[PDB]
């Protein structure tokens, strides 16, 4: 939930 996932 901290939302650190990479987006492209």
């Amino acid at each position: 939930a901290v939302g650190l996932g990479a987006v492209f």
Partner: antibody
Amino acid sequence: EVMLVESGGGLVKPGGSLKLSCEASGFSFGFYSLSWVRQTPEKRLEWVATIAGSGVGGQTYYPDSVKGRFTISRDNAKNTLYLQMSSLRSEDTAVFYCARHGEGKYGSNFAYWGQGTTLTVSS
Amino acid sequence: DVVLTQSPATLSVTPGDSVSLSCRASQTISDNLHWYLQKSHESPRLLIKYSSQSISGIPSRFSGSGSGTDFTLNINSVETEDFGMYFCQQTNSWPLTFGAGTKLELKR
């Protein structure tokens, strides 16, 4: 292959300063969030700092125990992550790992870990 | 801060046995709970993310479950190469925190 290679560890006196580096390869560096996590002599894992990736907002995050003492930064052109540590404490003694996070909504986990560099802080 | 309590702290099992490792959170953390194995002289390695999601390259004998506060890592037919320290870790809120680890040792 995802490669994360830390350097800079050493013996420092308390109150001193030291900068760690982590050189990365094998992935598109700037998109990813990166962290430092340390492992204490008691084998506890403790998160130290995070810097968000380019589509994540780029901000930095720290636990209270290092706020005002440590600074995480990145040089995307060099594929390098840094940890500038100041006002070091004996409790900072640990193996420091660089870690890369995952992708998308289910991607805040640590996905890859480095090999570690050792910091010993002692008078 | 979220406290993760791992049980048992240490467990000895014979290769081929199956185990269930427990991780209990002090407050609800949805499914934001990940598992790592650290073998001796090595860095941690992701086994399972977001309670139950599988990781390419990790054997099918590792399985995770749980949501809210109570999480389980199953290892079904533990192999010699699986012994080591198992940590859980949450990403529901800052600071990011880890459990203290379960040490899985080989019974002979």
